[PDB]
């Protein structure tokens, strides 16, 4: 199955100028625990934002052009990306906006972080029809000495 995982600010903002302009250690820890030991699929801009491979995960980068780093696996279409993951239980799509929009129709779960932050952005999570998803997990946290905003982890499953 295919899952998307994302962090959303107000208005579905997910990025600005190829970065995420918040800093939430709790949410990066949640990202790691939900992705480790799985394939991750990302677009080339997100690969450039992360700036290095992610350890302990098969890294599969979508680009139309040939790859430039053999520490990761480069593919040129959605179907090739899926094929390159092999027979695993859960593929994790880790963005960015253009890649999320393509994989939404093929996905069974969304792991969302809802962050209580108002920021300007240039990238959004795709609009998703709410009726088609059920919430199966919703865990709220107030801001603390490490995490400057409140946030909510949510898992949704396609009904
Ligand atoms: N908040 C979050 O959870 C989160 C998560 C991920 C990313 N982000 C943010 O999202 C932004 C990046 O997103 P983005 O929408 O600009 O870009 P993106 O989706 O990461 O990358 C798009 C690129 O991927 C390639 N691509 C996409 N679909 C393809 C396909 N079907 N076949 C072949 N290649 C394909 C293309 O590369 P080529 O141009 O090389 O052909 C395309 O330009 C950044 O601001 C980043 O910080 C936020
Ligand atoms: N929930 C969620 N939060 C995010 O921040 C996020 N970011 C991306 C894309 N960007 C990034 C940027 C950095 C790292 C990162 O450094 N993660 C490391 C270390 C985590 C840490 O230092 O705590 C990792 O091992 O996963 C991952 C993805 C995709 N999905 C997400 N999903
Ligand atoms: Mn805030
Ligand atoms: Mn909900």
Atom 44 of ligand 1: nearest residue by CA position: 18
Cα diameter, the chain = 44
Q: Whole-angstrom Cα distance, residue 111 to residue 4?
A: 6
DSSP output for 32-84: HHHHTTSEEEEEHHHHHHH-SPPTTSEEEEE-SSPPS-TTSEEESSHHHHHHH
The partner residues of 110 in beta bridges, in order of sequence, read 4, 156
Contact 72, 22 (CB under 8 A): no
Contact 46, 60 (CB under 8 A): no
Domains defined for the chain, CATH in brackets? 1-159 (3.40.430.10)
With a 6 Å cutoff on the Cβ, whether 54 touches ligand 2 is: yes
Ligand 4: centre distance to CA 128 (Å) = 12
What's the order of all strands across the beta sheet hosting 39-43? 73-75, 58-62, 39-43, 91-93, 2-8, 109-115, 151-158, 133-141
Q: Whole-angstrom Cα distance, residue 92 to residue 30?
A: 13
Label residue 17 left, alpha or beta by phi (over 0 means left) and psi (-120 to 50 means alpha).
left
Closest CA to 155 of 132, 137, 133: 137
- Measured from the Cβ of residue 137, the count of other Cβ atoms closer than 10 Å reads 11
Atom 39 of ligand 1: nearest residue by CA position: 63
DSSP output for 98-118: HHHHHHGGG-SEEEEEEE---
Residue 10 φ then ψ, to 5°: -50, 145
What b/e string do you get for 10-34 counting C-beta neighbours within 10 Å, with b at 16 or more?
Answer: eebbbbeeeebebebebbeebbeeb
The data reach a resolution, in angstroms, of 1.0
Ligand 3: centre distance to CA 18 (Å) = 21
With a 6 Å cutoff on the Cβ, whether 24 touches ligand 2 is: no
H or E segment to which residue 3 belongs: strand 2-8
Q: Whole-angstrom Cα distance, residue 19 to residue 71?
A: 22
Atom 29 of ligand 2: nearest residue by CA position: 94
> Residue 96, class by beta-carbon neighbours within 10 Å (0-12 exposed, 13-18 middle, 19+ buried)?
buried
């Amino acid at each position: 199955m295919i899952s998307l995982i994302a962090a959303l600010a107000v208005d579905r903002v997910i990025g600005m100028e190829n970065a995420m302009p918040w800093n939430l250690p709790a949410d990066l820890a949640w990202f790691k625990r939900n992705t480790l030991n799985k394939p991750v699929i990302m677009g080339r801009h997100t690969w450039e934002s992360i700036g290095r491979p992610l350890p302990g995960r098969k890294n599969i980068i979508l680009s139309s052009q040939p790859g430039t780093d053999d520490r990761v696996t480069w593919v040129k279409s959605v179907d090739e990306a899926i094929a390159a993951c092999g027979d695993v239980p859960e593929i994790m799509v880790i963005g960015g906006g253009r890649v999320y929009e393509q994989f939404l129709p093929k996905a069974q779960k969304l792991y969302l972080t809802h962050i209580d932050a108002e920021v300007e952005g240039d990238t959004h999570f795709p609009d998703y029809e709410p009726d088609d998803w059920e919430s199966v997990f919703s865990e709220f946290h107030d801001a603390d000495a490490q995490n400057s905003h409140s946030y909510c982890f949510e898992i949704l499953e396609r009904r």
